[PDB]
Structure formats: C-alpha cells, structure tokens
Symmetry: C11
Subunit: 184 residues, 11 copies
C-alpha cells in the first residue's frame, strides 16, 4: 500500500528524469513585493496538479505537522497576522520532505478574515516549499536567478483559454465504477 | 481492508484520468465577497458526492485532526467568531492529504448560533480544501483564474429539477440485505 | 471482525448504489429558524435506522472523539448553552468519517436541563453530520437546495400510522438464541 | 474471544431482524416533565435484559469512557447537581456505539445523595442512549413520535405479576458448574 | 487463559439461562431511606458468592478504574463525605461491564472512619452495579418495581442458620494440593 | 508462566469447591470498635497462608496499584492519620480482583510511627479485601451476619500451641536445592 | 529466562513444602519499642539468605517501585524523618508480591544521616514485608502471636560462632569460571 | 521501501566515489558579511538538485525535528528576529544526519515578513548543513579554507544561460504515466 | 543475549554455591563512625571485581534508576550535602535486585566538591547494597554481627603487595583481537 | 539496512586497524586560547570526511539528542552566549557513542549572529567529540599530550593546493544513475 | 547486530582474562588535590583506546542518560560551576554499566568557558567511571590503594615518544574501501 510500495525501475527512471525539467512560463506568476521588485511564484493548484501527474493521485501525500499562529496585532482598526505551518510530503515508497510555510495578512479590518487568510496561505506555502525538494519540475527552479532571467527573455504569452466542453457535468463515473467493481 | 487495500491497475488508471476533468458550471456557486467581487466555490454536499463516486462510499475517509476556536469577540451585542479546523482525508490505499478549513460568523446576536456556524463551516471548508489536493475533478480547478473566466463565457444554466420519483421511501434495502447475508 | 472485514463485491455494489438514493418526504422534518425560514432536517432515530439497514446493526459504529461545552451563560434567570461534539463513524471495513455536531439551549431556567439538551443534541447532530458523508441515502441530499425545492413540489403526506401488532412483547428471542447456540 | 468473534450468518440475520421490532407497552414508562407533558422512557433494567437477550450475556459490553460532574449548586439548603457520562457499548464482534448520558438532582438537602443520584443516572442514561443505536428493539423507537401516538391508542395494560416460584434460592448452579468442568 | 478463553456452547447456554432467574427473598435486604421509604438491596458478600457460582472463582474479575473523593465537609464536629468509584467487571472471555459506585458517610466525628466507610462502600457499590449488567440473577431484578411488590407478597422468612460443622479449620487443602501437583 | 498458565479441570474443580468453605473460629479475631461493638476480622498472616495453600506460593500475586495518604492532622501533640491503598490480586491464570484498603492511626505522638502504622495497615487491609472476592474460604464469610452469629454459638476455643520442634533452623533446603538443580 | 521460566513439579513441590516451615530462634531478634514491649523481627541479611536458598540467587528478584520521603522535621537541632518505600518481589516464573516498607530516624543532629537511615530502612523493611507473602519460611510467622509465645518457651540460645576458615580470600572462582566457559 | 532498502554494491561504490568530488565554481555564491569579508555558500535549490542526483528523488529525505523562534525584538520600528531549526536527513537505507540551521532578519519593519524570512531560512540552512555530512559533493568542501583559495585562483565565470526550449509546458507525463500503469 | 540467556545447570550450581562463601579479612575495611564505633565496609572496586568474577564481565549489569539530591545546606562557609541513588543490578538471565545508596559530604567549603562526593558515593553505595542481595560472597555477610566478631578474632593481616610485573603496558590485546575476528 | 547490518570479518578488521592510526599534521589546526597557549583541534569538514572514508557515506550517522541554550547575557551592547549540544553517532551495525559539544560567542553586538554561532558550533563540537570515541584516526589522539609534542617536532608544512580540475561541474552522475537503475 | 550479538566462547574467555590485568604506569597520571595530596587518574583518550582494543571499535557503546548543571555561582567576577552527567556504557551483547560523572570549574571569569569545561568533564568523568565496572584493565584498579603504592615503587618512566611516520596523511582507506565493497 502507501508507504509500503517501492518504485519499479521503469517508474523510477521516468520520474527521475521528468523531475529535472524546468517549468515553462505557463506556470509562473508574479506579485509586487511591498517596496521590492516583482516576485515570481507558482500558484497552488498548479503545484498540486504537477504532483498528481508526476506521482499519480495516490502516489504522494501531505500532512500538516503543525501550524502556529505567530501573532495577531491590532493597529488602528487594522489587523496584522503572522502564521507559520509545517508541511510534510510523502511519496508512496516512504520517501519524504518537510518544510515551513508562512501566511500573512496585514490590512483587513476583519480579524476572522485576516486569520483565515494567513492560516490557509501558510499551509499551501508549506506544501509548495516541501514539494520543491523533489526537483525543478515541482518548483525548485523558481528560486534559480539564472532561470528567472531566462524567463523574461521569453514571449510573455497570454492566459490560456480553458475548454470546458468535455468538463464533468454529473457525479457518476462509469469507467471508474466498473474498474472498482472488478477490484472486489 | 481500509488503509491496507492497494489500487488495481484498472481502477488506478480510471481514477487518475477522471480526476483530471474540470467541473462543469453545474457544480460552481457564488457569494458576494464583503466589498470584494463574486467568489466562486463548490457546495459541500457536492464535493462529498463527487468523492463518493470517484472512490466509492468506502474508498475515502476523513477525520478532524483538530479544531481550534481562534476568537469569540463581542461588539455591541453582535458576535464575531473565528474558527479553524484541520481535516485529513485518506484513500483506502493509505494515500492522504490534510488541509486547514476556516469558519466565520460576524453578525448574529446569538453566541451559540455564531459558534455552531463557525465550527461546522471550518470543518466542511477543511474537508473541501483537502480533497482539492486529489485533482481538478474534486475542486482543484476552482482556484484556476483561467478556468473561472471560461465559466462566465458559458450559458448560465438554471437550477436542475430534482426528480424524487424513485426516491427512497422506507428503511429496508433488499438488494443490500441480500448481498450482505451472502457475505457471511 | 470489525475494522478487519472487507466488503465483498456483492455487498459493495449494492450499498454503493443504494447510498445514491435521495430520501423521500417520509424522512424530512422542519423547524422554524429563529427569524429565518423553514429549516429541513432528518430526525435522529431516522438516520440510525437508515444506517442499521444500509450496513447492518454490526456494520457501522460511532464514537465521541470529544465533546466540549463552549459556554454556559446566565441572562436574567435564563440559561444560554452552547456545546460541540466530534463524532466519528466507522464501517466494518475500517472506512471512516468524522464531523462536528452542535447542541443548543437558549431558554430554560434549569441549568441541568439546558446542558442535558445541548450535550445530547451536539452528539446526535455530530452523528448525523458524519453519516451524511457516506451519501445521499444517509442525509447528504438534505443540503441540496435543488433537492429541497423538489420536496415542496410533492404531496405533503400525513404521518404514517404505526402498526404495533407484531411488536416485541417479551425479552426472549428464540430465533436468535438458537442461531447463537449453534455458533459455539 | 470478545472483540475477536465474528457473527455467523445465522446469528447475524436473526439479530438483524429482531432489532427491527418495536417495543410493546410492557416496556414503556412515563414521568411528568417539569411543566412539560408526559415523557416516555424505558427503565434501565429493561434495556439491560433486552440486550442480554439480543446478544447473550457475553455478547455485548459497555464501559464508562468518562463522567464529568458539570456543577453542584447550593440554593438555600437545596442541591442542584448536573452530571454527564460517556458510555461506549461494544458487541462481541468489535462493533460499537458511544453516547452521552445525563444525571440530575435538583431537590435534596443532602449533597452526597444529590451526587449519587446524578452520577448513577448519568451512566444508565448513557448506556441506554448507546444501545438505542443498535435498533428499535433496544429503544430507537421511543423517540419516534408516530410510534408514541400508536402507544396511547392501546389498552393501557396493568403491571405484570412476577411469579417467584421458580426463583433462584441458593448459590450453586449444577447445570452451569457441569458444563464448565467439562470445559477444562 | 483469562481474557483469552471463549465460552463453550454448554457453558454459554447454562449461564445464559441461569442469569435470567430472579433472586429469592433470601438475597434481599433493606435500609430506611433518610425520610424515604424502605430501600431494598443485596449485600455485597451475596453478590460475590453469586458471581463465583455463575462463573467460577476464576471466570470473572473486577478492577477499580478510578475512585474519586467528591468532598469532605466538616459541619460542627461531624464529617460529611461523598466518594465515587468506577468498577469494571470482566469475564474470562473478554466480556465486560463497568459502572459507578458511590460511598457515603454523614455522621461520624472521625475523619478517618468517615473516609474508610465511603471509599469501601463506593467500590462495593460499584462492583454490584457492574455485575447487575449481566442479568437478573446478579441483581438486575432489584430495580424492577413489579419484582419488589411480588417480594412483599411473600413469607418474610427468618435468617438462615449457618451450619459450621464442615467449616474449614486448618490451612492445607489435600484435594487441591493434589490436583495442582498433577498440573505440573 | 504466571498470567499465562490455565487451570486444569482437576485444580479448577478442587479450588472451586474449597473456596466455598467457611472459616472456623481458629481464623477469626476481634477488636473493640470505638464506641461500637465487637468487630471480627481475620489477621493478615492468616489470609496470606490461606492463599498460599489455596493457590500455591506461586499461584497468586498482588501489587499495590496506588497508595494515597488522605490526611495527617495534628491535634494537641497527637497525630490523626488516614491512608488508603488499592491492591490488586491476580491468579496464575490472569484472573484478578482489586480493592481499597484503609489504614488509620489516631493516637501516637510520633508522626513517623503514625504514618508507618497507617500505610502498612492500608495495604494489608486492601490485600485482605481483595482476596475476599475469591470466596468464603478467603474471607468473604467474615461479612455474613448469619455466619457471625453461628460463630458465637460455638466453643470459644483457646489459642493453639505452636510446636516449633520441626521448625527451620538453618538456611539450606536440600530437598529444594535438588529439585531445582534437576530443573536446569 | 527470568519471568519466563516455569517451576517444574519437583521444585514447585519442594519449595511449596519448605515455605511452610516456621523459623527457629536463630532467625529472630528484638528491639525495645519506644514505651512498648519487646518487638521481634528478622534482620535483613537473614531474609536475603533465606530467599537465595529457597529460590536460588537467580530465582527471585526485587525492585523499588517507589520511595517517598514523607517528612523531614527539625525540632531543636534534632531531625525527625519518615520515609516509605514500595518494594515488589518477583520469582522467576512471574509470580510476584509487593508491599510497603517504612524507615524512621528520630534522634540525630545530622540531616544526611537521618535520611540515609530512613531511606535505607524503608527499602529493607519493604523487601522483608514483601517476601513475607511467600510463606512462614520467609517471615510470615513473625506476625503470629501463638508462634511468638512458643519462642519464649524455648532455650534462649547464644550467638552462633562464625567459622571463617573456608572463607573466600581472593576474587577468582575456578569452579564457576569453568562451568561458565563451557556455557558458551 | 524507504528506510528498508539496502544499497547494492554497484550503487554504494558509485555514490561513495561521487561524494568525494569537490564542487566547481558553478555552485558557489557569496554575500558580504556584516563588517566581515566575503562569505561563500551554496544556494538551496542547488543543494537540493545535487541530492536528487546523488540519491534520486526517492533516495533521500528530510524532516524538521523542531524549529524554535529564539527571539523577536523591536528596536525603533525595526524587527530583529532569530530562528533555529533542526533538520534530519535520511537516505533510503536508514542512514541519517541531523544538524541545526539558523534564520535571521534584522532590518524589516514588518513583523510577519521578518519571521517568514527567519523561519524559512533556518530550515533551508539546516537541510544544507545536514547534507554536508554526506561528503564534499554535497557541500562539505564549502568550509575548507584551502578549497576556497583555490576557488579565487579560478576564472570567475559568468552566469549560465538557461535554455527553456525543452521546458515542461503542460501537466501530463506520458513516459511516467505509462511506467506507472504497468506497475500495477 | 543479555536478559535473554538462561543459566546452565553447571554454572547455576557453581555460582549458587560460591555466593554462600563469606568474605575474608582481605575484603573488609573500616571508618570511624562520627561519635560511633568502627564501621566495617567493602571498598567499591572490590565488590566490582567480586562481581566480574562471580558472573563474568558480561554476566551482570547495573543502571541508575534515579538519583535525587536531598539537600545542599550552607552553615558558615561549609557545605552539608545529602544525596540518594537508586541502583538496579541485573544478571544475564533477567534476574535483578535494586536498592538505595546514599552519599554524604559535610565538611568542604567547595560546593562543587561536596556534590561530586555525595553524588558519586550515593551511586557506589547503591550498587554495593544491590549486589549484597545476591549472597554473602558479594557482601551480604558484612551486616552479620556474628560474622564481624569472627573477623576481629583473626590475624589482622597487612596490606597485600601488588605485583605490577605482568601489568598491561600497551592497548592492543592479540588474544582478544584474534578470538573476535574469528567471531565474524 | 542501517542499525541492522553487521560488519563482515574483512571490514571489521580493516577499520579496526585503520582507526588506530594517528592523524598527520595535515589535519591539525590551532587557535589562540584567551590568555592560554596554542590550542590544537581538527576542523569540522575534516572529521566528516574522515568518517565518510572510514565507514562509507552510509556507514555512520548522527543525530542531535538535545541542544540547550545555557545563557544569553548582554554586557554593554555586547552579547555573551553559551550553548551545549548532545550528539549521538551510530554506525550501521548499531554501535554508538554520544557526547556533549559546546558553542560560544562572546563579542558580537548582534544577538542573532551570536546565537547562530553558538548553536552551530555546539553541534559540530558535539559530533567531533562523539566520533573521537571510535579511535585515534577520528581525533582521539588530538588530546594526547605526547602526540602533540611530536607534532611540533615536525615540518610545519604549508597549506595544500586544491586541484579543482576534476571538480564536479553539473548535477547529473551517470555512474550513479546507472547503478541505481539496475538496483530496481 | 549491536545489543543482539552474543560473545563466542573464544572472545568471552579472552576478554574475561584480559580485563583482569592491572594498568602499567604508562596509563596513570596525576593532579594536585586542592590542599589534598597527589591524585592519580587515567586520561580520557587512554580509557577510550583501552576500550576500543578490549571490545573493538564496534563492541562497546555509550550514551548520556542525563546531564544536569548543579549550579552556576558568581563570586566577584569569578564563576564556580558544578555539573553532573550520567553515562551508560553497553557492550554488543547487551551487557551494560551506568555511572555518574562530575565536572567542575572554579576559577575562570568567562561563564561560557566555565560551563564548557564542567559539562565536558562531567561526561568524560562519567564514561571512565562506567567503564571501570568492566574490570581492572579499564581502570578499576586506579582506586585500589595497594595498587597505587606498587606504582610509586616503580621506575617513574618518562613520556613516550610518538612515532608519526606511519601516521594517516589522507582520507581514503583502500584496505577498508575494499572489504566494504565486498560486503555488499
């Protein structure tokens, strides 16, 4: 099962090579560092899908070891919250990597919304930082300065159109339901 | 049994493909962010059924690792409550994902009702964020901006009529009761 | 035994299909939300029997992970109590779901009665919310708005008459006592 | 042994059916709710014997997970005590249900007696509410309103005469002592 | 061994039936409830012997899960002590029942004697309440009102004369010493 | 070994019968209850030898689960101490009974001697009460009122003369040393 | 090994008989009870050798479950110390007996020497009281009043002369060293 | 699996030799020590990839044993934060090394940003320091002074151009997906 | 291994006999009890060598269960320290004995030196007291008064001259190194 | 695996001999003791490489049992920090040695930098001191005074030139990647 | 492996004999007791090498059970620190011995240096004291007064000259690398 399974030579080699790949500009994003420059990053749902593809929906897993709210300060009706979270990712073979994630909220007048924001972000930021340990294909390149420069020198493509034609429209999954029944 | 069972090739493949699917507009919903714009999300019962289909009623499970009431403030007879919950989802093979959920209640004059709302919501919010990790089909797309735009550019269909003709009207389940008896 | 046993293909398929069923109006009830509208819900004993049927008296179980009394306030001779309970339900194969239940009591002059009410309700509310995770047949539809509308558009039938003719009148159970003796 | 044993198809089916039965009026009792109406309930020793029959003296078990004394107030020489208890019932196959019980004492001048009453009641109430989870035959009907009305519409029979002719009059049990000696 | 052994069909059936018996008036006793009426109960050594017969000296066992002294008050030279104890009884097959026992001491000038009384009584009271769970022959009848009335309607027999002719007068037990030596 | 061994039919039967015996007047003793009447009890060393014979030096065991000093009060140079002990007795087959003992010291001017007396007595008291659970032969009769009356109605025999002729006079045990050597 | 080994019939019987013996006057000693009479006891080293003989240097074992210093009071330059120790003795077969021991020091001006005396005595006392549970041969008779009287009625023999001719004079042990080497 | 697998002669030898290698200037970087000289170090993503190559994405793992925020001081609107983290790296064969990492932030006005920096750096710094323990190829040379001098005496090469032509542009990985499917 | 190994008949017998021996005057020493008489004792290194011989360097072991510093008092520049230690000795077969040791320092002006002295002595004293439990050969005689008198009545021999001719002069041990290598 | 593997005669013998070697001057370094003389030591990276060679990158491991910050004092803008670490080194066969390391920082004005220095140094110091236990080749000679004198009487050689021609220049390791793949 | 392995008769006998040896003057050293006389002791690295030779680099192990800083006093700019350490030493067969070590620093003006000295010394001191338990060859003689006198009566030889010609000059160890590779 999980934690038990050992990678086969074929899967090992494939994944080992694959993880080396660098991400295209279709994955990177940016925000304006407070006072600083443009900071690139990969959106959460991206990294999640990347993983599901690299290891399969049931080939990787993560858990929150711990989340600690550093502080919740109030400066004239505005809330400044700092939160950290420790996430640990594990592959089906027992292999694992753990890292710290950090969430922040410095404006909002709502305390609830400030926490919700910091807590959720800290986790995702943790999961992402943890998966980067597996290779460039999961984000380890995002840190490489040389990598970044090579990104600007590229055609700043425009958002991809999402074709929702073959989108799931109802619950049932005959293909799946069948395979499963034959699994008993 | 659960946590033991390993996915067969057929089921694995089926589920792995299925999970890639994006959700149709029949799954999305929206609220008016306080001051913000329109926020899309998927209702809980939806995500639950999606999973019961993707993995089977007994192919997935979840538990609340911990729930912490961040605060319960009283501003002139009105209650402002913030709650967070950590939910861990596991598949029958041992695979697992865990995330934070957040519940909020900022109006109500009733303390009881304010907490009930925040505690319940934090959990459901947690379970949803947890299953998102498994793929788009369980909500990982809901975050994708490109995905969202492609949703507006679609026929805003009207609520589906629920045919309660073949609805369950009594307790007994002969089909089930039979297969079970033969299981002893 | 329990937690050990794995579902046979027959039983798995039956239950998997059965759980999809939506409940008939014979299961729903309503209360008048304080200020709000009509709130639908399924009475506890209902959800219990639904479960004993879907899984067998010994095919499901539940336990109280934890129950915490949120507050016990006294406003002019009246008690306002808020209680939460975490219930975990487990099927015979190890499968499980856990959720928060909430109990409330806002009128009563009796402290004892206010707590008894809030504690007991929190548990049952927890148990119900946990079972909902298994599918529509155990309550997951009760949340579906489309489901609800289709309920109103139905013949508001009248309470079912309970035929107590074949009701149990004494302790002994020959049919059972026999099967058991032959089980040694 | 206990927790190990699995139900045989014969015993499972028998008990499964029996538990569906509804209790006759020979099991129901009533108290006058403080201000409220008539409340129906099943006396403790009743639920005990019902279970010793449905599962055999050694087929079910319960334990007190926890008992917490909520409060012990003194209002002018009179004691108001509220106690809760969590009881877990388990069948010989590992199956289990756990619920909250509540004990109350609001009159008495003796503190000792006030606690003895609430603590013992809380336990029994817990055990009864736990067993209800198994089915109607163990009290899940007592909650059904429809069930109740049908009870009033019945011949309010008079207390049963207890024939103490074949009552146990000495310690020894030749029948048992024998089977046991042959068990070594 | 103990906790391991499973009941043989012969023993199970015999004990199951015997436990249904109701106790004769030779087992009941009475005290004058403070202000209340006559309270019937079974002395402790009685319940002990009843159990050593129903299950054999080594077929049942009990332990004190916990004992808590609720209070020790001093009202003008007199002590008022309230103690509770949780006792768990287990049969050789793993079967078990646990209950609360209560001990009370309200007059005495001696603190020591007051506690000694309450602690010992709480335990025994706990043990008796736990054994009642097995059936009428161990005290589950003592609670039945119908049972009680039938007791009054009986010849209030006089204390049994104890024949101490064949009473044990020395330590050694040849019969036993022999069987044991042959057990090595 | 101990806790493992299961009683053989021969031993089980012998001990079962033997434990039923009532103790002769050679076992009983008495003290003058402070203000009360004559209290009968069995001296510790007696109960110890009774057990060593009924079960063999290695057939039974006891441990002090816990000992709590309830209080140590000083009233004008005199110490008043109350102590309780929880003793658990176990037979070689795993069978077990646990009870509370109580030690008291109300006169002494020495604190040390007062505690020593209470702590020691509490344990012994506990051990005796625990063993009583096994049967009359181990003290369960000492409680029976009918038993007691039958004791007075007997020839108050005079102390037994102890013949120290065959008393052990040196350490070595040839008989033993031999059996042991052949045990390797 | 230890706690594993089971006594063979030969050894069991031998030890079971030998433990019944009563100690000769060569084992008893006496102190003058502060104000009280003459108190008989068995010196520590004696009980140790008795045990090493009854069971073999490796057939019995003891551990200090706990030692608690009750108090250390200072009355005008003099220290009054009370200490208790719980000792558990175990035989190679798993059999065990645990008791309390107590140590006292009431004169000394040295705090260190008072504690040293109390702590050490409490342990030895504890060990002796524990061993007493195995039989008269290990001290259970020392308590018997009838035994004591029979002791005075005996020739108060004079201290035994210790022949140190065959006393060990150097470390090595050829006999042992040999057997051991052949044990590898 | 992981922690279980043992290195084969071929892989052990290869890795053993590889780890000896010193890093080229393509790996080293520098910062201006506050007041001090030029400090060389290896950026995190570098060390990560180095490891993924030396051991394979699933041949090594790390976890945060603990992270402690040493201090968070505020000197005139500026935050001074110090954090330490303990990271433990483990190879697939059970081999392991653990070290301390330290994160620092001494300028920033934002508390949130000051912690995020320190916490994240402390972890990476820890992971790097732990990996150094495996050999020069993972950073152990970076400390060697002689090594450093030989680095300046080298052609200070210019940043490497990153060719993003064969960069990953979409989620799916056919090569992998295939190998995986054949792994079931 | 250790704790596992069981003594062979040969070794058991040899050791059992040997332990009976009494120590010659070559083992005893003396100190002048503060105010008291001459106190006899065995130096530490002696007891150690005695044990290494009786059991083999790997046949016995000891651990410090606990060491508590009772007090550290300062009376005019001088330190008075009292420390106790609990030592547990175990033989290779699982056999064990545990005792209390006590360390004292009452003169010294140095706090450090006072503690060093008492902590160290407490342990050794503990180890010695624990080994006594195995027999006279390891010190159980040192307590016997009769033994002592016989010691004075002996030729107070003069210190033994130590022949350091065949003393170990270098680290290597060819005989050992050889047997070891062949042990692989 | 690790902790499991047992050395083979060949490897044992080789390492046993090699560990005896004394380090050449190429390993020693020196600092100027505050006020004291010249202190010799071995740089961290040296010991690490020495161990990777003696045991193999996967033949030894270490962990930080605990790290405690002793003090952080501030004397006029300067920080004096003392820290200790307990490191435990383990060889692949289970063999292990543990020691204390100590880190110090006494000048710096920065608190962060002072701690980082002390925490890091304590661990490295710990690791070095722990590895010394394995023999001279890992630093045990560094203590030997005689060894040190012989070092001064030697040609104080000049720093070794590091040839970075065959230095690792890219991530991939073909030799390794190959062997690994064949390991699946 | 370690803790598992059992000594072979050859190795046992060899070590058992060699441990008896007394150390030559080449192992002893001395310090001038503050006010006291000349104190003999064995230097740390000596004991370490002695052990590596008696047991093999992987035949013995040690750990620090606990280290407690007794005090850190400041008397006019000078620090007086007292520290203790408990060290447990274990042989590959499971055998073990634990002891207390003590570290002291009474002059220094630096707090850091005072602690570093004491903490380090306490551990080494503990380690030596623990190893002594194995026999004279590991230092148990260093205590013997007769042994010491015999040392003075010997030629106070001069420091041994350390021949660093065959000293290790580079990391690699061909002999070992070979045996290891063939071990896979």
């Amino acid at each position: 099962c999980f934690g038990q399974c050992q990678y086969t030579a074929e899967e090992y080699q494939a994944i080992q090579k694959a993880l080396r790949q660098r991400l295209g500009p279709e994955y990177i994003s940016s925000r304006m560092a407070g006072g600083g420059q443009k900071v690139c990053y990969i959106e959460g749902h991206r990294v999640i899908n990347l993983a599901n593809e690299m290891f399969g929906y049931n080939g990787w897993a993560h858990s929150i070891t711990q989340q600690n709210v550093d502080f919740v300060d109030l400066n004239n009706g505005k809330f400044y919250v700092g939160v950290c979270a420790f996430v640990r990712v594990q592959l089906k073979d027992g292999s694992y990597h753990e890292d710290v994630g950090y969430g922040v909220s410095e404006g909002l007048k709502s305390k609830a919304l400030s926490l919700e924001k910091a807590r959720k972000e800290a986790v995702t930021d943790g999961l992402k930082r943890a998966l980067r340990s597996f290779g460039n294909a999961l984000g380890n390149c995002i840190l490489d300065k040389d990598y970044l420069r090579s990104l600007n020198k590229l055609p700043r493509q425009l958002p991809l159109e999402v074709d929702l034609t073959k989108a799931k429209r109802q619950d049932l999954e005959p293909s799946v339901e069948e395979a499963r029944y034959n699994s008993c």
